[PDB]
Amino acid sequence: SQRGSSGQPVPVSANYLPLKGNMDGVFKYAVGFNPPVEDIRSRSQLLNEHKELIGLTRVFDGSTLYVPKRICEQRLDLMSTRQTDGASIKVTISLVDSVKNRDVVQLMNVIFKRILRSLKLQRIGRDYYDANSPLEVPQHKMQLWPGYVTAINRHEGGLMLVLDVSHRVMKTDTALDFLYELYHFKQLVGSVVLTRYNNRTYEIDDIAWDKNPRCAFQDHAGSQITFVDYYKRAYDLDITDLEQPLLIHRPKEMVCLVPELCAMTGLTDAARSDFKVMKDLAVHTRVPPEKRAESFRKFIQRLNTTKEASELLHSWGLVLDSRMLDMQGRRLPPEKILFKHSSIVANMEADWSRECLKEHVISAVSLLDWAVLFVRKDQGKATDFVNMLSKVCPPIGMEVHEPKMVEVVNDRTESYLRALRELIAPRLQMVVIVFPTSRDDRYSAVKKLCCIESPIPSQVLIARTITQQQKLRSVAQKVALQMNAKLGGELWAVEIPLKSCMVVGIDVYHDKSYGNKSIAGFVASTNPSFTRWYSRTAMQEQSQELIHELKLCMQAALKKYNEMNQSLPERIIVFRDGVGEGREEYVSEFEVPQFNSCFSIFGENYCPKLAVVVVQKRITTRIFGRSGHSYDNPPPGVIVDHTITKSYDFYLVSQHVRQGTVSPTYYRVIYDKSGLKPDHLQRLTYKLTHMYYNWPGTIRTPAPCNYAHKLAFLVGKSLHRDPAHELSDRLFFL
RNA sequence: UCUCUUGAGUUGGACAAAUGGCAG
RNA sequence: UGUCCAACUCAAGAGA
Ligand SMILES: [Mg+2]
Ligand SMILES: [Mg+2]
């Protein structure tokens, strides 16, 4: 089954409130009116005529209806009459069906968007902010409100109310204070102002520097009344200024908001400019799991400590739970990092930087012939850096010889390009370019030349990272491993019990920059220990023939497998990426058929066992580690394939964090033929987390996903073209 | 562009579709 | 009129 059992069980907790609603007798009621009447307001008024006979549990979308209590007729047929025109309306009620809960999710979402209103919360976009539970910051005069975003769904364990807490700031000084301290024009427009007397938000359209409270608006189409009298009579307050501006708002008449009882929101430009403000608001926004779970329990307490919600739920009859989703996941074992003539079991943090910086990498290419490349201003920064590579490569097995320093005339791209053209040759192994600063055009120009026209593995590094001693040592130590990566010398490895199991990672450039050309990205191991790779690209303005070049790419990769292993992979595991919740049906229905089509060509009915996987990094879910009764981030490698998965997927916490809560990674398995028990696939997806040669440690997603992503993001932002085919067997994109 | 991570504010695009508000 | 997605910029943590 979906279950997997490898490691030591750990008690966890997610941010879900399971529901126990038993939705019966609430069958959909179809509303039909013979007289054409299409106006939500009018339809509601018409329906209200026979209200008492129906119930008090309206869910009316304007076309259909849901109510749990049976009305005293199956196909009820009554009559009503309008009032704007008086047309007699014919009621036709029909029991539609009770087949499946593919929309009960929608019904529950609606009733909860109503419940969150029942608690006197102020909807603002996606968020239902609170106003009785601010987080004062009485040093910037600011203030911070918590925002809940409930999104019910159906999981393996019934229905679960996901919950995500988001904060949106609410200043406190009156807007007139801002006007005063702006003189002694353009920040207000677009600012979501709100008034304090009733805690009602107000988006702003424009300002008019010609009006005052002296002006009188006709009240309810009645008599003219000055704003001062209006506010005194309706809110018992007064206004001091007499010639101040007024703030204008118009929905999809004109609304005048006085700039003394208005309180801005969001942040200004100078507000974001400061970094002390950011540091202050980082304490409350970047919340460790302790305060996070406390803020969740605060929400649930506020939910169940108000009758309205209780009797509304009881009216719908579905019971809400009183505590987070207690659970029991498991923790996969640590992973044996290998080297040449060594080994080590990763930390509890799974970060073996110290061990890697002083151990012998597996394959190290002697960097005999190479050339630095810098503008004269950065002589020292370059030379000082080079020496460091000679003090940190010998420890790790790389042998470095004196480079061939080059002094480009001037920083203009033209000069760099001429220098590279006159410098490349068959005898160079790598070129190092040091830029005075980051200019996207320059970097793209250099990378086209080093990857397309004259293929040589390049390494750029800006003239700011290499100017800070007491940290330059590790910068050199990282550049050395990256450079050794772009030469075909693998760095470290990890034990793999799956023999002859190739791996593949695909990504598609997520943008609309270059003619909407739909770049691709491909990478596929070529040895049983996932140490070497094979990077190819495909860029076409089609969504099918692009799949055809992915076919050709993976055929080429599977060939390269044979050319270096004297066999063929018994299993192929493809790691898609970034495919949201929008088109996950297209993959399993077109891509997988395409894949399994053309594999028998190279052998006797060669049908290698494919298995796709979709990998999501951003998600609202959050797994917690529960030791006793306190909450803490899970240690790396805590699988959860129970009670929150939907269909043969699993969450996984492979990262380690030092700042706030750790975000699990959601691996859907959208096609399975590999005959891998889910335990082995989970442990493999954990292993590959360790094999991304840009970070000694564990990364949020597997290695192939990140490699393919960097390849696509290079080809689609700098090269705009296919990189040469001499650089396939290396990793030139790091 | 040395590299990963977690928050914040902007941005457009794949869909569906026309608002809970009595504010002024 | 709202939602599920995905890019870039700023700030911060870790790097003997
Ligand atoms: Mg991607
Ligand atoms: Mg790189």
CSV table of C-alpha atoms (C1' of nucleotides) in Angstrom, one decimal, chain A residues 117 197 202 220 230 235 285 438 459-460 462 465 482 622 692 694 700 734, chain B residues 1-10 13 18-24:
chain,number,residue,atom,x,y,z
A,117,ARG,CA,-17.4,36.5,9.3
A,197,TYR,CA,-14.2,53.5,14.5
A,202,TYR,CA,-10.9,50.9,2.3
A,220,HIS,CA,-29.1,58.7,2.4
A,230,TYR,CA,-22.0,63.1,10.4
A,235,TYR,CA,-19.5,57.8,16.0
A,285,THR,CA,6.7,37.1,11.2
A,438,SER,CA,26.5,42.2,-11.6
A,459,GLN,CA,33.3,30.2,-13.6
A,460,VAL,CA,32.2,33.7,-12.9
A,462,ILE,CA,31.7,39.0,-8.7
A,465,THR,CA,32.2,38.2,-2.7
A,482,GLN,CA,32.0,24.2,-7.9
A,622,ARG,CA,3.8,22.3,8.1
A,692,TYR,CA,23.5,18.4,-5.1
A,694,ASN,CA,26.4,23.1,-4.8
A,700,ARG,CA,14.8,20.9,0.0
A,734,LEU,CA,26.3,25.2,-11.5
B,1,U,C1',26.7,36.4,-10.6
B,2,C,C1',30.2,31.7,-4.0
B,3,U,C1',25.6,28.6,-2.3
B,4,C,C1',21.5,27.1,0.5
B,5,U,C1',17.7,28.4,3.6
B,6,U,C1',13.1,31.4,6.0
B,7,G,C1',10.1,35.7,6.1
B,8,A,C1',8.3,40.6,3.7
B,9,G,C1',6.6,43.7,-0.5
B,10,U,C1',5.8,44.0,-5.5
B,13,G,C1',-1.1,34.0,-16.1
B,18,A,C1',-20.5,39.8,-11.8
B,19,U,C1',-19.7,41.3,-4.9
B,20,G,C1',-22.6,40.8,1.8
B,21,G,C1',-22.0,46.7,2.3
B,22,C,C1',-24.5,50.0,4.7
B,23,A,C1',-21.0,52.5,4.1
B,24,G,C1',-20.4,58.1,2.5
